[PDB]
Curated annotation (Swiss-Prot), chain B:
Source species: Rattus norvegicus (Rat)
Binding positions for L-glutamate per the UniProt entry: 85, 87, 92, 138-139, 186
Function: Ionotropic glutamate receptor that functions as a cation-permeable ligand-gated ion channel, gated by L-glutamate and the glutamatergic agonist kainic acid. Binding of the excitatory neurotransmitter L-glutamate induces a conformation change, leading to the opening of the cation channel, and thereby converts the chemical signal to an electrical impulse. The receptor then desensitizes rapidly and enters a transient inactive state, characterized by the presence of bound agonist.
Quaternary assembly: Homotetramer, and heterotetramer with GRIK4 or GRIK5. Can form functional heteromeric receptors with GRIK2. Interacts with PRKCABP. Interacts with NETO2.
Extracellular side: 116-253
Organ and tissue specificity: Expressed in the olfactory bulb (at protein level). Expressed in the deep cortical layers, dentate gyrus, reticular thalamic nucleus, mammillary bodies, pons, and cerebellum of the adult.
Note: The postsynaptic actions of Glu are mediated by a variety of receptors that are named according to their selective agonists. This receptor binds domoate > kainate >> L-glutamate = quisqualate >> AMPA = NMDA.
Family: Belongs to the glutamate-gated ion channel (TC 1.A.10.1) family. GRIK3 subfamily.
PTM notes: Mass spectrometry data suggest the protein is N-glycosylated at five distinct sites.
Identification of the protein by name: Glutamate receptor ionotropic, kainate 3
Glycosylation sites: 199
Localization: Cell membrane; Postsynaptic cell membrane
Coiled-coil positions: none
UniProtKB/Swiss-Prot annotation, chain D:
Post-translational modification as stated in the protein's UniProt record: Mass spectrometry data suggest the protein is N-glycosylated at five distinct sites.
Cell compartments where the protein resides: Cell membrane; Postsynaptic cell membrane
Subunit architecture: Homotetramer, and heterotetramer with GRIK4 or GRIK5. Can form functional heteromeric receptors with GRIK2. Interacts with PRKCABP. Interacts with NETO2.
Presence of the UniProt keyword Glycoprotein in the record: yes
Keyword line: Cell membrane, Disulfide bond, Glycoprotein, Ion channel, Ion transport, Isopeptide bond, Ligand-gated ion channel, Membrane, Phosphoprotein, Postsynaptic cell membrane, Receptor, Signal, Synapse, Transmembrane, Transmembrane helix, Transport, Ubl conjugation
Further details from the record: The postsynaptic actions of Glu are mediated by a variety of receptors that are named according to their selective agonists. This receptor binds domoate > kainate >> L-glutamate = quisqualate >> AMPA = NMDA.
Name the UniProt record assigns to this protein: Glutamate receptor ionotropic, kainate 3
Positions on the Extracellular side per record topology: 118-254
UniProt lineage: Eukaryota, Metazoa, Chordata, Craniata, Vertebrata
Shown part of the complete sequence: 433 to 805 of 919
GO process terms (BP): chemical synaptic transmission; G protein-coupled glutamate receptor signaling pathway; glutamate receptor signaling pathway; modulation of chemical synaptic transmission; negative regulation of synaptic transmission, glutamatergic; regulation of membrane potential; synaptic transmission, glutamatergic
Length: 253, 253, 254, 254
């Protein structure tokens, strides 16, 4: 019964440190949507596991020499059996790792202060006053870096140049939108979570694309297909809807 | 000690049966759901009376948040069961309960044969051919809430053109026959209509995948009883029979 | 070389030789529900394949030694990668091979001529005038042979006795039901098919049990879960209920 | 009710057993077995916490002269427990004092006895008188014999009810009696299957005398019985009770 190593990262409301009056340790430290999903997978498949936060705190992207970092790298180097996180399924990633079928669908959109004229990526790309960016070495950054749409190449040209447009993680980005004249390009279900809690913030425009989160495994993993089946089972039983309603609030706004 | 069953007229699910000597009460009806409902009362032993829903609608929420149609009857405890082709949706689950599904369906397109229109994207790209859905049903709500770019575009259209949203299927079917109109309609009804009308066809495949379930007010102890009874009928492979029975039918050269 | 080998057998309307004037070869020889299912599975999963009829024409059962025959044996001996057929998933066969999730439901029931008093397996079990049996070395036979239920043991003891009550295949059992005083223990979806083509036969009673057909693989095969995922996709696209209507449709009886 | 549900059960191999350890265990962690795994699946599917309590009198449950119950059935009647999770037999008389889930296991009464003897059926035992036989006191097998009107089983009850010693306190006493004296135990078939795979000098005599099932027990009106039935059907559909049975019915030899 060897324990599977699960790689992940802190990201509200998917993976969080649970509140306690003493120092917690091991798996007991964590709670959130992806923790509940992991618990379901472990139950259905019958495995035990050890959660390990990815050291560099990244989701994963390729450098110019094609080397990966983040959770994707942990899977490639067979340091982890599974990545259980809001890990975006993308063509470039499917070349290096395997994914389950998606457990949640989302798309790229914009987080910004309420009360302004702007209503689309178009408006940001036109102007230089309002700064904008995305999480460094995640799928949204890669989306822009790869885009052939004029508006998005324009936006990448910006993000790529401005030293601090690319933020370390979502939290740093959300604080930037509250602290400065800055809009964050961010995945839509996280926006949904934030705007039900911070009434100062809103989504700008709609979804720029449509994609999904999946459980990541190393290529050739003998678990990936069973995990797909389990996700399809949870879906059929309405369990992912229940899990989302559990973690998305709360009250406000 | 009898249950009030809310429904509406819809072939081949609920129909006024043909006879000479005027019929009263439950005797007024035949159809797939009528048979289904008989099989459920046998298994669970209850008495009931069918009541057609006044506004003729399935159910959707207004801006204010009030529901109408059968969904509203259950909310208001004006009915015990909704026995009809009532689509299980995550939105409705917030307001009422459903049994496990008794039939699968997905949104798809009903249009005349022999055109070049091949998918929803084809309808969304143009404006000569109009298109719509049944007002205040699940398919309308699907387009209204959609975050997918093509379906948002379609929703802008339907939502704007007068009379693109039809009062019921029959009126939508008639608009498909007499005008340049495509109806966004559930696949099991499309199946029923296209083997009776050889000049109509399903365009594309399923846009989504859902089922029909028996509706109850939230918390009702019958929901689970009805699920057990539906499972029983599935083990006795009796529902697939009931379907073949009401779906006939001589075909199209 | 890496094409998958598919074992199957002829069984209307699942797998049949296509009618043509010009001689057909290879996979093009075949048509039917399981052939359409196979094409869909191959599209989804991305494989090419070669269909081969199982030599002994049997589905599969175990002799007294413990040795299997039919399609089950082809899988056990790693002679085929998949069994694509109306192959009944049973707990007994699960000990030797693996199955996908089911793509169709069925149960054992009774095929007999119309116009008699018989209405249940118990009516058959009480009386010796009317002969009855099942396809030899299939799941229905095995169900009776393994049953611990008194009535089915009784029925097994009867079938087991009659020299020719255990028929070679469905087509033979169908003919014996037509020409002798004989009832065939047969899977319900086949009865459905037959009773709509032959208005002098009918199903007697309901289902005795409830089971499914699944694709068989050798035990431990990675294709097993892949095939399940592909079946779930076809179910989401509601393609199997349609495939079924395509192959079972026809003019009924008065 | 309460927050954690109270589960009544009793020690019966291989359904519920004390797990092995080199320290004193406590609470739910004391237990292992088929019915413990089932309970774990139910608790996960329904989302409840629970506390297992062994039934004080160690009985399954029967009615005395008045209708006074004992054993697990009694714990449910009196609402001392929310569920009974055990190889609890579904019978008419119990169905009138408590509710049961759909069955999670099918079984029948049969005979456990030493190998070798010419004994071959209940009839054989009923005639003769040297070989004693009995059943577990205040269990469903005892009650079946008491209430029977079949000649052979009436004779058998006549014996068992006359002897002070025929009826044993539990399966374990009875099994030991079978190994200790010329004695046959009337016992449920899946327990016989477990025992005969471990005790190679014991065997089943004859077949199953009836056919019934085990179900999860709840007090009448429990808000949990329907959800539990749906859970068991769900587990069955995934082959999980087959897997669970294979896990606990192991042994070696025979
Ligand atoms: N979910 C993203 C990180 C967030 C983002 O890029 O917006 C990923 O998998 O890379
Ligand atoms: N069956 C749908 C009505 C028809 C439709 O929306 O297409 C419902 O339950 O709302
Ligand atoms: N489908 C059965 C053969 C037909 C029957 O046994 O009735 C099997 O897989 O063995
Ligand atoms: N399973 C039985 C106990 C054992 C027996 O009576 O043989 C019961 O629930 O009473
Ligand atoms: Cl321990
Ligand atoms: Zn679960
Ligand atoms: Zn490795
Ligand atoms: Zn589904
Ligand atoms: Zn009410
Ligand atoms: Zn839902
Ligand atoms: Zn395709
Ligand atoms: Zn092999
Ligand atoms: Zn099994
Ligand atoms: Zn159909
Ligand atoms: Zn489980
Ligand atoms: Zn009480
Ligand atoms: Zn089943």
């Amino acid at each position: 019964n060897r324990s599977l190593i699960v790689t992940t990262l802190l990201e509200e409301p998917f993976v969080m440190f649970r509140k306690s009056d003493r120092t917690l340790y091991g798996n007991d430290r964590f709670e959130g949507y992806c923790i509940d999903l992991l618990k379901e997978l472990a139950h259905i498949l019958g495995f035990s596991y050890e959660i390990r936060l990815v050291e560099d705190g990244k989701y994963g992207a390729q450098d110019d020499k094609g080397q990966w970092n983040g959770m994707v790298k942990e899977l490639i180097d067979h340091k982890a059996d599974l990545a259980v996180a809001p890990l975006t399924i993308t063509h470039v990633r499917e070349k290096a790792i395997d994914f389950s079928k998606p457990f949640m669908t989302l798309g790229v959109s914009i987080l910004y202060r309420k009360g302004t004229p702007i209503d689309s990526a178009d408006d940001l790309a036109k102007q230089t006053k309002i700064e904008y960016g995305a999480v460094k070495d995640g799928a949204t950054m890669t989306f822009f870096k790869k885009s052939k749409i004029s508006t998005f190449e324009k936006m990448w040209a910006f993000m790529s140049s401005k030293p601090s447009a690319l933020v370390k993680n979502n939290e740093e980005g959300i604080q930037r939108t509250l602290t400065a004249d800055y809009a964050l390009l961010m995945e839509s279900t996280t926006i949904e979570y934030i705007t039900q809690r911070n009434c100062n913030l809103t989504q700008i425009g709609g979804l720029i694309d449509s994609k999904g989160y999946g459980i990541g495994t190393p290529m050739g993993s003998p678990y990936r297909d069973k995990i797909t089946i389990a996700i399809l089972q949870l879906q059929e039983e309405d369990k992912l809807h229940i899990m989302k309603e559990k973690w998305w609030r709360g009250s406000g706004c």
